[PDB]
Amino acid sequence: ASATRIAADKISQSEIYRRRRQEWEIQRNNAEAEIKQIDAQLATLAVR
Amino acid sequence: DKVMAEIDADKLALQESRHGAQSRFDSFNTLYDEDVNAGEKQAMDLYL
Amino acid sequence: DKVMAEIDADKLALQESRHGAQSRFDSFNTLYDEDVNAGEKQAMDLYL
Amino acid sequence: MVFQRLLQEQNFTESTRWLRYIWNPAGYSVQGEMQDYYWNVRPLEEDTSWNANPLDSVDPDAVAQHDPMHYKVATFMKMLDLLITRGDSAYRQLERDTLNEAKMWYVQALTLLGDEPYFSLDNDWSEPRLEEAASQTMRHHYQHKMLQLRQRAALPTKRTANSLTALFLPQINKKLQGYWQTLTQRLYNLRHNL
Amino acid sequence: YQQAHQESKQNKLEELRILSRANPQLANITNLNITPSTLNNSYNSWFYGRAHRFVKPGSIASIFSPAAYLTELYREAKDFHPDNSQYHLNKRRPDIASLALTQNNMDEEISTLSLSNELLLHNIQTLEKTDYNGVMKMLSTYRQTGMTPYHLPYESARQAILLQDKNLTAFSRNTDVAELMDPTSLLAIKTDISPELYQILVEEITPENSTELMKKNFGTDDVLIFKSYASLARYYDLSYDEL
Amino acid sequence: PELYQILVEEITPENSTELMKKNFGTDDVLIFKSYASLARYYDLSYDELSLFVNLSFGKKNTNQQYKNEQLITLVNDGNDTATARLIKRTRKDFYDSHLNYAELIPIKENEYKYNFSVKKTEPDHLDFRLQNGDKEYIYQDKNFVPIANTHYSIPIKLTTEQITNGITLRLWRVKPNPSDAINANAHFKMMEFPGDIFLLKLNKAIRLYKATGISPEDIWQVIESIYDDLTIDSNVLGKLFYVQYYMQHYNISVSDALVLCHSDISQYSTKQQPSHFTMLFNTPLLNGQEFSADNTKLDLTPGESKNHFYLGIMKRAFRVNDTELYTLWKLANGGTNPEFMCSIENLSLLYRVRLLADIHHLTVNELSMLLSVSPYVNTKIALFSDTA
Amino acid sequence: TLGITPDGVAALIKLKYVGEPETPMPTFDDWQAASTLLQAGLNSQQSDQLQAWLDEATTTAASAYYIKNGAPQQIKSRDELYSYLLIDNQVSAQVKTTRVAEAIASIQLYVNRALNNVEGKVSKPVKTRQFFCDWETYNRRYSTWAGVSELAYYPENYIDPTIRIGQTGMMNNLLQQLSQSQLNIDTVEDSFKN
Amino acid sequence: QLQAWLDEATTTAASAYYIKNGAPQQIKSRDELYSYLLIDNQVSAQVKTTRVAEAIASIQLYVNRALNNVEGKVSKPVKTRQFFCDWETYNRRYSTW
């Protein structure tokens, strides 16, 4: 029972690491959209 | 003419904001559609 | 002339926003490219 | 199970090894010489009835145990999954050396698949009424014909009219068609600069 | 029962074993050593080319099509009632038995309530043995039930006028042609008063004309024809508050 | 230039075997033997190949053999020439209102088989008749009710002249009571060629489809608008240029350019898309009953019609008033109103003038003004050539 | 502002309800002529709007007439007419549904009403077939029915290498030993030796 | 733009002519011509690749087609060298090699 308890802890740690990576992926996509938007704002500022 | 081109570049900036908002919505939707992961459900069953 | 100089300083402000958006994107990308750390993988192996 | 888990954790060079432990299309090198087979499991080579009475409950594992050809087909679909995800992981990196690798994986999947069944389909249907199609007499006659098929019935050679005209037709499975569609979409995007 | 069930199970198993190796997708695949089940010729000779005939996914002819689902549904559901019972499927809905299982009926997206209208008008035509125009003529003048008469050209005309000139501002502008228009006719334009409904509203009720007009507007005499608030509200489609 | 030489050359029975060598190489007409080899040779899809070729292969498993309302039926033993018989259904009046399909299939020479299926059966008529353009009842079986959604087969004896000219079979259900006889008619027209000339014509038709990207029914319509017997020529290529140029010039549709390029309103329907005729006239069905292009006289003066069905249908289909319709018909005949027959040949060139007003963003009164100040004041638009 | 001719305006005024004497009553064909006169004067948007409104009016006319004249005696409301005819006569005309889906919904409503014995006399021996023992879970909707029939025909689509009904304790312990985010070759070989 | 369009037209001219006139008899489609010649004739002209990478991709396609025995007659003793025992993991791509 102790061995399968600590196996549950191991798989829980693996899944929380996977969720941390997915959240970092969200943040990276948001920042890439942001840098594209500010680049296009630089373009319209040059036109103005 | 240059005023109209500024309007066009501003529309391009708005599209590039909308693309990242779309990707964030799709990523959160595919996160929400799977409540538990395979490993998360495995850890629940191991605790049980 | 002063109106045009105001446009120039606004472009400088936009560049300084874009630099920080770039640094945030690069930091999140180098966070995402390593899923687990060396210590995190070590802790997984120790639980196993 | 090990290969599926290595695919989900994306250890590709080990997942393909653990798939080589069961299926290799390139044959097997045993004591330096090649072999005459491609399936490393003998009840997959010779279809052994693992499970008599499989339809007592709804279990795809029970039906695939009743004949292991379905296990063989699912193994091939897992191989196609591995190849197209190698191609997708190569395609998402967006370098022109990796695009050749992605086209290599998609070409390898396509030449494992072969030719898509295009003109061999029917597109041919004598449309009955619902009253004709739900004929319990016709359905019973069809089952009686099936029992005559397994009892071999001497094949009476009396060429009569096809009383089973309103029978619905067999359908090819959706997943292989999805594989064909995504492979030709990948190669269309790769053969342009998309 | 157990032996017949076992026979049906093994017939389904043999059919599955025949058809699952005659798949056209699994022909040109490299190094998948699959032989046909040595009864494929027997299947094609018994059923004339059925294993030879595989169908496209998403077709009307497919065994997983909604037509196949409907066929199995009707074949298993047409026996809940005795045949002479008025709740039997073919007796309550003879249209659903003779539906042609075609790709047009499968994929042609018609609006519902058009099927309901065609079904009701076809049942009224089959009942009264007349044409559609005759049904509309009799429905434009039927006075016995509530929510009826229904003058369909009048309804088409008043909805066309309400779509073109909402709120009747042409009546307010062009007063010299508004002189020619009747106020009750403009009432019939702005809200629904059929010509038969106007004849119902405009007729006077004498003690002499009482029993005849009660036949003309209700049918039966003998004043206790509703007997309850519920029957009255159901006959006129009223709420308890409106009643 | 070589493709133009391929398209412009004529195919005689004398020049057949030589031109088959010049355009294919090998003789002996069975050079494709399969749909897959044809589609591979011409780089066609099965759908694009289905626009042209609909053979007798797989006959027994269907009751409808016509694909895109056409059917080729090649017969053997024609002195080993393998002559083909292309038959095109045309879907005339009351087709969609009273029946599912209605196909005329040749069995042998002067031996034809009528396949149909009555939708919404009528129990109170029982008098099956079958005439051709109201001339003579070909098949007539009193006391027979075709029940709903059932594929019936009726043998029909038809002469080669009557089938090579466009025939219009008319399915009747008359009642012995003197009330209404339900009319439902479709139009057929067969075309017969020897195999080599058929292959060469199909070759240049498929090459023109590959070159232009235009519809095969559309090239049928433009070749029918000028010539007969399907001879691709320089006038056909000019009209095929002009439909494309008008379709790019204005934002009109294909059939909308067809009406402008001296063709008629197309009655070709499909299960994909309805006919342009029923789209224009009967898609929002006016009084339930549909509009049928009958030769019924109707005086278009704004007070003497009293046939409000066709009048309202024309006014809604042309988006026009009574007076504006009358002056539209007056422009079509040079300020006169001889007689309106309500035929398809009048509905086209009544629609041509409306399109002429609309594509230049003019009202019909403005078009009448501009033609009144033109050098085209009292000219006959009904009697124009395509160049005029 | 009505989009017609002044003679059409005079024809509309000649349909006066109460006007001058010695003018005859407006006939039904006269009303139909005025109706198509006004109906030809609309564009496609107003034509679709008018057509939808006319359908939604003629349904509540014809249903009341059918309830009054020809129906079984138990039918007294529009909901009872729906419960009989298995097609909803109260749906506004924005809803679209093909004929086979309407027939499927009608037969499914008939089955769900017959199973609860709301009808006259349900034949109880027909109620206990295997198709109706599996009604509540599989056969009620087309999606689950097609999923069960696909699981019968192509079980290769539904087998996953991870879970299986009847897998052993050593297999489950291997799956516990194998379910991490990181799987080395040494880790999977130690798990395989275990 | 004109040059790219003319190249993308002359490839689908010349490939059909090569399939018709001079080719082994098994070649009947453009995909079969690709599978023979090991160079893709359907790629639009925006894609750039040097000659050594084209030759590398051609030989790698030839090896991956010969290992699955899709060709006529694969010499089975050549198939079991150490270089092809390490083909699946190392020698398939230049980076891992």
Author numbering:
A (entry chain D): 2185 to 2232
B (entry chain E), C (entry chain D): 2088 to 2135
D (entry chain A): 1797 to 1990
E (entry chain A): 50 to 292
F (entry chain E): 244 to 631
G (entry chain A): 875 to 1068
H (entry chain E): 923 to 1019
Paper text:
The ~1.4 MDa TcA is a homo-pentameric bell-shaped molecule that mediates target cell association, membrane penetration, and toxin translocation. TcA is made up of a central, pre-formed channel that is enclosed by an outer shell composed of a structurally conserved α-helical domain decorated with variable receptor-binding domains (RBDs). Cryo-EM structures of Mm-TcdA4 and Xn-XptA1 in complex with heparin reveal that the glycan interacts with different parts of the shell domain, including receptor-binding domains.
To address whether heparins/HS bind to a different region in other TcAs, we decided to determine the structure of a TcA from another organism in complex with heparin/HS. We chose Xn-XptA1, because it also shows a strong binding signal to porcine intestinal mucosa heparin. Expectedly, the obtained cryo-EM structure at 3.7 Å resolution is very similar to the structure of Xn-XptA1 without heparin, but clear densities corresponding to heparin/HS are present. However, their position differs from that in the Mm-TcdA4–heparin complex. Instead of interacting with the upper region of the shell, they are located in a gap between the neuraminidase-like domain, RBD B and RBD D. This binding pocket is not directly connected to the α-helical shell and is predominantly formed by polar and charged residues. In particular, a docked heparin oligosaccharide interacts with N1090, N1092, H1121, D1582, and S1584 of the neuraminidase-like domain, Y1548 and S1580 of RBD B and W1663, K1665, N1674, R1677, Q1678, and P1679 of RBD D. Since the RBDs of Tc toxins are not conserved, this binding pocket is not conserved as well. In the case of Xn-XptA1, the heparin/HS binding site is closer to the membrane (ca. 4 nm) and is located in a cleft between two RBDs and the neuraminidase-like domain. Taken together, our results show that the heparin/HS binding site is not conserved in different TcAs, although binding itself is.
